[PDB]
């Protein structure tokens, strides 16, 4: 055919190991992304999964051809035959391309020398979540990538006009957060091997607390009301009062343990930890109130709900 | 040239 | 351990109360110890957390046996 | 285009007649392999498995006279796949369980 001869001519005398314009000028690469879906944000492991269609285009004077054919649209077969930039993701704990049924890669070659190379990736990017206030935490999770071995003088990156072709967010597995937006940056990081141009995409995610309300906040408020109801029970009922108080505080301890299990292992008190601590204070105070009463009730009947509501207002407004 | 001798030794070993 | 001591301010003639409080406190101490040790591997020696949990267990068990001693001195 | 052709000739000359089996200075003094590490993350230090997960940019440099070129005044950074055609130290971590 007329296309097979073009490919044979292009690959004839083609050094796959050499980048375009090596020793001449840095190779400008324009990268674009289609964020198919931001997968689950694993706050416990400080990582999140993202599925993308990563596209990168560059000019290669070796891959230029003049003929009636305008483009050479090719599958993954030709990806390994020509020079592809060694773009790796700096904050990817583990990433893998898609191979079923065939490798999910595309490669198009224009007459001038444009080489649009796209592939589908599933990156388990590392987002350094700072959950000092949880579950109201808002995170700007990045996704960096750069050439692994080619310094700034040999491979330069740049963002095409279309910033990021983010897909429809309805089908995303992002249950915890809501995708607020995207923002791109391009900075020259210095390291031991040289200076490398790094392009980073920050996805801004804002947490939703509805599941945490029905999961943690509501049970703790209900058990605090269970602590409250002890006051209306007659003071003479020593076993009843003591039983209600102990059941309340012990199940509060259990609820605190499971709520902390939801969180990762981090050494700082969070907002949920503050709320459960205040609930501890309330239930323990009710038990001690009956302890001192046996060894006043109406004052507690007012102070406990009012203190809890005022603390709720102060805590929630923050 | 210094390593060529061991290269020839290995090639002779793996030959046939 | 702090709430185990409130048994001491309760009236001596409250067996159903003090006994239940001490029992709940000691069983919760056991539960906390087991929950902490399950996360760690099957390590065959006592750790600092293990020794602190065991000390606090000895304290709460002593409070329960303090009520036992009071009941046996009054009734028995 | 002169530089591209010259670099292609230089790399082809270097790789031609190269024996991956023999280390640099084979049958001679030991090759000094300097090592450099840039830790990027320590993902998790687990006591249950008695292990820690560490991510790093493990770099190593050594002198190989067979890979010495002087026609061009620059440092040639090549495709990663050329590492399959060049001798590299058989470095391993005695502690690693899955890497
Ligand atoms: C230590 O040992 C381990 C194994 O114990 C080695 O790991 C193996 O390495 C080989 C060689 O590099 C890999 O084979 C390659 O696999 C490509 C697709 O792999 C996918 O499927 C396999 C299952 O078969 C999965 O295991 C892979 O997932 C794992 O690997 C990826 C990284 O690759 C990780 O990110 C994952 O997390 C997993 O760990 C993948 O899902 C396959 O395409 C490739 O074959 C192409 O390339 C060769 C090169 O010679 C060609 O001959 C061949 O024809 C193919 O080329 C066509 O396709 C490419 C696609 O782009 C086109 O560009 C070409 O033009 C052409 O059309 C190759 O077979 C193997 O996957 C990997 N893992 C195993 C076996 O589990 C380590 O390398 C080794 N060394 C070290 C230092 O660890
Ligand atoms: C291919 O790669 C090589 C190595 O990676 C590059 O060679 C390096 O080039 C840089 C460019 O400047 C050199 O940097 C500076 O070199 C000065 C020359 O010192 C020489 O002599 C002393 C004598 O003891 C040696 O110890 C030293 O290693 C050199 O051989 C140094 O004086 C400099 O020292 C300090 O400079 C700045 C000052 O602010 C500090 O910031 C630095 O951290 C450092 O402390 C500096 O080292 C470098 O030395 C070269 N290294 C080698 C091994 O040659 C080639 O340039 C590169 N080819 C290219 C880019 O085309
Ligand atoms: C993603 O990255 C791209 C490229 O870095 C960002 O697009 C760039 O945005 C700047 C500022 O808006 C543009 O500069 C301005 O261009 C206008 C129109 O020509 C001109 O009137 C201004 O004086 C200024 O020069 C820049 O042109 C544009 N890049 C391209 C290729 O057009 C984009 O904003 C980023 N997306 C984000 C941050 O969400
Ligand atoms: C007289 C008195 O003070 C009483 C009060 C409480 C009693 C203890 C309770 C637990 C018992 C377990 C086993 O039955 C062995 C004996 C055992 C340790 C008892 C010893 C005598 C005690 C201290
Ligand atoms: C920057 C960019 C933009 C689009 C692509 C792309 N190329 C294809 C080919 C096929 C299919 C199914 C999807 N492709 C997608 C992703 C897409 O557009 N979706 C999901 C609506 C790649 C890179
Ligand atoms: C391709 O052929 C056309 C017409 O023969 C010519 O004008 C053009 O310069 C050629 N391009 C090349 C050789 O790159
Ligand atoms: C007792 C009522 C508890 C809930 C109060 C919520 C107040 C609204 C805060 C919204 C953010 C400013
Ligand atoms: C083998 C180590 C012993 C573990 C238990 C220690 C208990 C000592 C504290 C008791 C305080 C009254
Ligand atoms: C969403 C948990 C707090 C609900 C308010 C309760 C005030 C008594
Ligand atoms: C929960 C509100 C009802 C109790 C108020 C009336 C008792 C004086
Ligand atoms: C040490 C626990 C609280 C004890 C309070 C008893 C009533 C004064
Ligand atoms: C005598 C106290 C009555 C309590 C009124 C309701 C407080 C929630
Ligand atoms: C091995 C020391 C045990 C200490 C026990 C304290 C009294 C029950
Ligand atoms: C502590 C147990 C032995 C002493 C009990 C009181 C006297 C019978």
PDB file of N, CA, C and O in Angstrom, chain A residues 261 265, chain C residues 32-43 47 49-50, chain D residues 46-49:
ATOM      1  N   UNK A 261     -10.986   4.898  64.244  1.00  0.00           N
ATOM      2  CA  UNK A 261     -10.612   3.878  63.270  1.00  0.00           C
ATOM      3  C   UNK A 261     -10.911   4.344  61.850  1.00  0.00           C
ATOM      4  O   UNK A 261     -10.186   4.001  60.908  1.00  0.00           O
ATOM      5  N   UNK A 265      -3.700   7.031  61.027  1.00  0.00           N
ATOM      6  CA  UNK A 265      -2.899   7.130  62.248  1.00  0.00           C
ATOM      7  C   UNK A 265      -2.089   8.419  62.185  1.00  0.00           C
ATOM      8  O   UNK A 265      -0.965   8.450  61.679  1.00  0.00           O
TER       9      UNK A 265
ATOM     10  N   UNK C  32     -10.433  -3.110  75.954  1.00  0.00           N
ATOM     11  CA  UNK C  32      -9.468  -2.162  75.405  1.00  0.00           C
ATOM     12  C   UNK C  32      -8.124  -2.840  75.202  1.00  0.00           C
ATOM     13  O   UNK C  32      -7.468  -2.658  74.167  1.00  0.00           O
ATOM     14  N   UNK C  33      -7.694  -3.637  76.184  1.00  0.00           N
ATOM     15  CA  UNK C  33      -6.426  -4.346  76.049  1.00  0.00           C
ATOM     16  C   UNK C  33      -6.442  -5.273  74.839  1.00  0.00           C
ATOM     17  O   UNK C  33      -5.500  -5.286  74.036  1.00  0.00           O
ATOM     18  N   UNK C  34      -7.520  -6.046  74.682  1.00  0.00           N
ATOM     19  CA  UNK C  34      -7.590  -6.979  73.561  1.00  0.00           C
ATOM     20  C   UNK C  34      -7.653  -6.245  72.226  1.00  0.00           C
ATOM     21  O   UNK C  34      -7.016  -6.664  71.253  1.00  0.00           O
ATOM     22  N   UNK C  35      -8.418  -5.154  72.156  1.00  0.00           N
ATOM     23  CA  UNK C  35      -8.505  -4.393  70.915  1.00  0.00           C
ATOM     24  C   UNK C  35      -7.154  -3.814  70.528  1.00  0.00           C
ATOM     25  O   UNK C  35      -6.773  -3.846  69.351  1.00  0.00           O
ATOM     26  N   UNK C  36      -6.414  -3.275  71.499  1.00  0.00           N
ATOM     27  CA  UNK C  36      -5.086  -2.754  71.192  1.00  0.00           C
ATOM     28  C   UNK C  36      -4.154  -3.867  70.730  1.00  0.00           C
ATOM     29  O   UNK C  36      -3.391  -3.686  69.774  1.00  0.00           O
ATOM     30  N   UNK C  37      -4.197  -5.025  71.393  1.00  0.00           N
ATOM     31  CA  UNK C  37      -3.262  -6.091  71.047  1.00  0.00           C
ATOM     32  C   UNK C  37      -3.597  -6.743  69.709  1.00  0.00           C
ATOM     33  O   UNK C  37      -2.703  -7.287  69.053  1.00  0.00           O
ATOM     34  N   UNK C  38      -4.865  -6.715  69.294  1.00  0.00           N
ATOM     35  CA  UNK C  38      -5.224  -7.299  68.003  1.00  0.00           C
ATOM     36  C   UNK C  38      -4.576  -6.543  66.850  1.00  0.00           C
ATOM     37  O   UNK C  38      -4.169  -7.150  65.851  1.00  0.00           O
ATOM     38  N   UNK C  39      -4.482  -5.217  66.960  1.00  0.00           N
ATOM     39  CA  UNK C  39      -3.853  -4.428  65.905  1.00  0.00           C
ATOM     40  C   UNK C  39      -2.378  -4.783  65.754  1.00  0.00           C
ATOM     41  O   UNK C  39      -1.867  -4.882  64.634  1.00  0.00           O
ATOM     42  N   UNK C  40      -1.682  -4.973  66.868  1.00  0.00           N
ATOM     43  CA  UNK C  40      -0.279  -5.350  66.852  1.00  0.00           C
ATOM     44  C   UNK C  40      -0.128  -6.822  66.476  1.00  0.00           C
ATOM     45  O   UNK C  40      -1.078  -7.600  66.586  1.00  0.00           O
ATOM     46  N   UNK C  41       1.055  -7.231  66.020  1.00  0.00           N
ATOM     47  CA  UNK C  41       1.269  -8.645  65.695  1.00  0.00           C
ATOM     48  C   UNK C  41       1.258  -9.510  66.947  1.00  0.00           C
ATOM     49  O   UNK C  41       1.237  -9.028  68.081  1.00  0.00           O
ATOM     50  N   UNK C  42       1.283 -10.824  66.721  1.00  0.00           N
ATOM     51  CA  UNK C  42       1.308 -11.803  67.807  1.00  0.00           C
ATOM     52  C   UNK C  42       2.700 -11.787  68.431  1.00  0.00           C
ATOM     53  O   UNK C  42       3.529 -12.674  68.221  1.00  0.00           O
ATOM     54  N   UNK C  43       2.957 -10.748  69.217  1.00  0.00           N
ATOM     55  CA  UNK C  43       4.278 -10.500  69.783  1.00  0.00           C
ATOM     56  C   UNK C  43       4.323 -11.123  71.178  1.00  0.00           C
ATOM     57  O   UNK C  43       3.420 -10.863  71.987  1.00  0.00           O
ATOM     58  N   UNK C  47       4.637  -5.184  76.279  1.00  0.00           N
ATOM     59  CA  UNK C  47       5.091  -3.878  75.833  1.00  0.00           C
ATOM     60  C   UNK C  47       4.724  -2.824  76.873  1.00  0.00           C
ATOM     61  O   UNK C  47       4.045  -3.105  77.862  1.00  0.00           O
ATOM     62  N   UNK C  49       2.750  -0.198  76.531  1.00  0.00           N
ATOM     63  CA  UNK C  49       1.298  -0.063  76.531  1.00  0.00           C
ATOM     64  C   UNK C  49       0.667  -1.247  77.249  1.00  0.00           C
ATOM     65  O   UNK C  49      -0.296  -1.092  78.010  1.00  0.00           O
ATOM     66  N   UNK C  50       1.211  -2.448  77.029  1.00  0.00           N
ATOM     67  CA  UNK C  50       0.694  -3.634  77.702  1.00  0.00           C
ATOM     68  C   UNK C  50       0.832  -3.509  79.210  1.00  0.00           C
ATOM     69  O   UNK C  50      -0.111  -3.805  79.950  1.00  0.00           O
TER      70      UNK C  50
ATOM     71  N   UNK D  46       4.676  -0.500  59.047  1.00  0.00           N
ATOM     72  CA  UNK D  46       3.728  -1.438  59.626  1.00  0.00           C
ATOM     73  C   UNK D  46       4.446  -2.371  60.592  1.00  0.00           C
ATOM     74  O   UNK D  46       5.467  -2.977  60.243  1.00  0.00           O
ATOM     75  N   UNK D  47       3.903  -2.481  61.805  1.00  0.00           N
ATOM     76  CA  UNK D  47       4.423  -3.395  62.810  1.00  0.00           C
ATOM     77  C   UNK D  47       3.865  -4.801  62.660  1.00  0.00           C
ATOM     78  O   UNK D  47       4.498  -5.760  63.113  1.00  0.00           O
ATOM     79  N   UNK D  48       2.688  -4.941  62.048  1.00  0.00           N
ATOM     80  CA  UNK D  48       2.103  -6.265  61.854  1.00  0.00           C
ATOM     81  C   UNK D  48       2.982  -7.097  60.930  1.00  0.00           C
ATOM     82  O   UNK D  48       3.289  -8.261  61.213  1.00  0.00           O
ATOM     83  N   UNK D  49       3.405  -6.510  59.814  1.00  0.00           N
ATOM     84  CA  UNK D  49       4.301  -7.181  58.888  1.00  0.00           C
ATOM     85  C   UNK D  49       5.766  -6.907  59.185  1.00  0.00           C
ATOM     86  O   UNK D  49       6.632  -7.479  58.513  1.00  0.00           O
TER      87      UNK D  49
END
